[PDB]
Amino acid sequence: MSHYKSNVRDQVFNLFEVFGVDKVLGADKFSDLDADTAREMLTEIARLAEGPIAESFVEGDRNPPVFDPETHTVTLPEGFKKSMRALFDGGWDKVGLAEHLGGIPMPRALQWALIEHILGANPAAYMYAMGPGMSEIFYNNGTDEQKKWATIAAERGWGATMVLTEPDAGSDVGAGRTKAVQQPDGTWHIEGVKRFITSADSDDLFENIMHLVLARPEGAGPGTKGLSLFFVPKFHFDHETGEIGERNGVFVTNVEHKMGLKVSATCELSLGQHGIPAVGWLVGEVHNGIAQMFDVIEQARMMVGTKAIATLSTGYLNALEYAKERVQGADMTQMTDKTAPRVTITHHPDVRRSLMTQKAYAEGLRAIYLYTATFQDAEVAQAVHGVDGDLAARVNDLLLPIVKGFGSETAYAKLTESLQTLGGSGFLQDYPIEQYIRDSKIDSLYAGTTAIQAQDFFFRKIIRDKGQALAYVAGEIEQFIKNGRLKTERELLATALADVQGMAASLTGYLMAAQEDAASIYKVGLGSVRFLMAVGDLLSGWLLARQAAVAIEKLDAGATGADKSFYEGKIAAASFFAKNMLPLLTSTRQIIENLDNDVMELDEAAF
């Protein structure tokens, strides 16, 4: 088959047997969607991913997009455009779209499980297909007049972009200098140059593109608070009929040459620099840009984390399939006998160590993003967790930098084990794992770098939150710990929870002490990424142990065959993760408890 190896079985296990999402299916908003239909949808998009979506994976990398300076457009390889048409023809770009825009109501947890397959098979294909979802965001934030445009945009399937970054404004969005000048008719003329813009042109995939552009109105204050958000279409159009009109003054000037994700055109985008104005419409006709734009950034960060996790998953399953068939060496119990029978490499302890590491992290990460998604619907959060709308929103906000920051970093790191499993053949383009590594390196950078994820997590999702979302999650872990075959895992989880609590307390002390000793805040910066990663490891270990508790129940109840194999794997992975990953958090806590400012005081010239 294709490079892409999917895991619907593990998705269904999470959605139904672990988190109970099927309990909201058929009820209230999800009245028209039953469990059987949900599973059928997952199987169908999994097949679409393994078939026509994956088919262009290699071609998009080997035959990458080309920028045409004669027209200021990008050309895409024909095989990739065929994959995109398969996505559209199936309606899959309406996944999770509101009913009034033509979508099928469904839990976010199911929505992201569906999207995981596209992200594993050809993740740029989902990015080009985020248009309808961006039009929903524009709808929710728009005026009544603007809601009619957004509806046209979704119905016609226009592409979309989020346009923030400039050459001098990446992590520091507030330093952007793209300008907005209001016109007599109430429109605005956008003037500036933006950098690194995903899908800024898309060949003839769509008839229009909606750029959602951050820009500073003349006279506005500084920083992100002075930014406003503007609807800037590639083509003008009839606000009533949608008929496509004259070109708007927003042009791609370049396409970047990247380590991976090559088929995703990443472009410099100039507004108002080529002889015609870039007409923009103030979104919601209010000046509230960074808040409006963060509706998009939140979705982007969930996507990027899910992408990295989807990619580790198919990397692991490729490595596993390879190991099952590769004969090399004799069994270690016979290593001195040079005529002992040769064995497949799954018989080697280091290879089984590497495979169980890939398995536990991939499945642990899938549980984390699905768990996160169960807090993105008020109804789901109430039904499956018993938490009200407000707490659910805070818990989701707490978890998103884990999905994004911990997911992106872990996936790239563990793909190294996936490649190692193939031996020298892992280094060949004949196998997909080296492209998996190249495509996923970007996941720790776009949508906010890991450092920005860890700062958000601590300063905004914990401290500003007064620790309420965090205390809720810690209480669910402690409950699991308080509760035989899982006694050892629960004891190791208790140590890990205490370690994370100790880290949180040390860093809170460093931050609070900054009122009287300004440089003490640096120790928060020094520890923040390690803290984010430790929380991810704790969550992984907890969710895997929860999976193993369900697996124990199902084995006791008499599971057989392929079911039984699956459940035995969950017990093995939870135990391996508890005994080989969680203990490192104790030394990390002690490291964080002894952080100092020596490295901050060192002369830059000493580096």
Instruction: Please report, as ranges, the residues that interact with ligand FAD according to CB under 6 A.
Output: 161-165, 170-171, 196-198, 258, 266, 326, 328-329, 345, 348, 350-351, 420-421, 423-425, 427, 442, 445-449, 451-452
The H or E element containing residue 37 is helix 35-48
Q: Nearest distance from residue 367's CB to a second copy, in Å? A: 17
The partner residues of 229 in beta bridges, in order of sequence, read: 214
User: Which position among 7, 111, 135, 224 is part of the footprint of a second copy (CB under 8 A)?
Assistant: 224
* 123/132 with CB nearer a second copy: 123
- Look at strands 179-182 and 209-217 and give their pairing: parallel
Q: Give the closest residue to 365 by CA, choosing from 5, 70, 14, 97.
A: 14
164 binds, among ligand FAD, a second copy, none (CB under 5 to 8 A by kind): ligand FAD
Chain residues 393-412 in contact with a second copy, contact rule CB under 8 A: 412
Window of 94-102, 104-112, 258-266, 479-487 that interacts with a second copy by CB under 8 A: 258-266
339 near a second copy (CB under 8 A) = yes
Q: Nearest distance from residue 327's CB to ligand FAD, in Å? A: 8
327 near a second copy (CB under 8 A) = yes
Q: Give the closest residue to 60 by CA, choosing from 88, 35, 84, 24.
A: 84
In contact, 314 and 6? CB cutoff 8 Å: yes
- Those residues with Cβ within 8 angstroms of residue 179's Cβ, 6 or more apart along the chain or in another chain: 190, 191, 192, 215, 216, 217, 218
Helix 349-373 and helix 561-580, axial crossing angle in degrees, nearest 10: 100
Handedness of CA 481, 484, 485, 489 (dihedral sign): positive
600 near a second copy (CB under 8 A) = yes
Chain residues 27-46 in contact with a second copy, contact rule CB under 8 A: none
296 near a second copy (CB under 8 A) = no
Chain residues 63-102 in contact with a second copy, contact rule CB under 8 A: none
Which amino acid would we find at residue 313?
S
User: Which position among 27, 291, 428, 505 is part of the footprint of a second copy (CB under 8 A)?
Assistant: 428
Q: Give the closest residue to 583 by CA, choosing from 498, 521, 514.
A: 498
Q: Nearest distance from residue 332's CB to ligand FAD, in Å? A: 7
419 binds, among a second copy, ligand FAD, none (CB under 5 to 8 A by kind): a second copy
464 near a second copy (CB under 8 A) = no
Dist CA 308 CA 358 (whole Å): 13
Per-residue DSSP letters for 232-256? Answer: EESEEE-TTT--EEEEPSEEEEEE-
Chain residues 490-549 in contact with a second copy, contact rule CB under 8 A: 514, 518-519, 521-526, 528-529
- Those residues with Cβ within 8 angstroms of residue 285's Cβ, 6 or more apart along the chain or in another chain: 143, 146
User: Which position among 218, 246, 556, 603 is part of the footprint of a second copy (CB under 8 A)?
Assistant: 603
Q: Running DSSP on this structure, what letter comes out for residue 190?
A: E
243 binds, among ligand FAD, a second copy, none (CB under 5 to 8 A by kind): none
Dist CA 62 CA 56 (whole Å): 10
Residue 222 CA, distance from chain mean position:
30
Q: Nearest distance from residue 521's CB to ligand FAD, in Å? A: 11
Q: Nearest distance from residue 589's CB to a second copy, in Å? A: 10
Q: How far apart are the first and last CA of the chain?
A: 50
In contact, 51 and 116? CB cutoff 8 Å: no
In contact, 180 and 230? CB cutoff 8 Å: yes
Q: Give the closest residue to 202 by CA, choosing from 194, 211, 189, 193.
A: 211
Dist CA 17 CA 563 (whole Å): 13
The H or E element containing residue 202 is none
Q: Nearest distance from residue 480's CB to a second copy, in Å? A: 21
575 near a second copy (CB under 8 A) = yes
* 304/503 with CB nearer ligand FAD: 304
328 near a second copy (CB under 8 A) = yes
162 binds, among ligand FAD, a second copy, none (CB under 5 to 8 A by kind): ligand FAD
Residues 130-159, one symbol each (x = binds a second copy by CB under 8 A, - = not), give ------------------------------
Window of 140-148, 199-207, 236-244, 449-457 that interacts with a second copy by CB under 8 A: 449-457
607 binds, among ligand FAD, a second copy, none (CB under 5 to 8 A by kind): a second copy
* 183/587 with CB nearer a second copy: 587
451 near a second copy (CB under 8 A) = yes
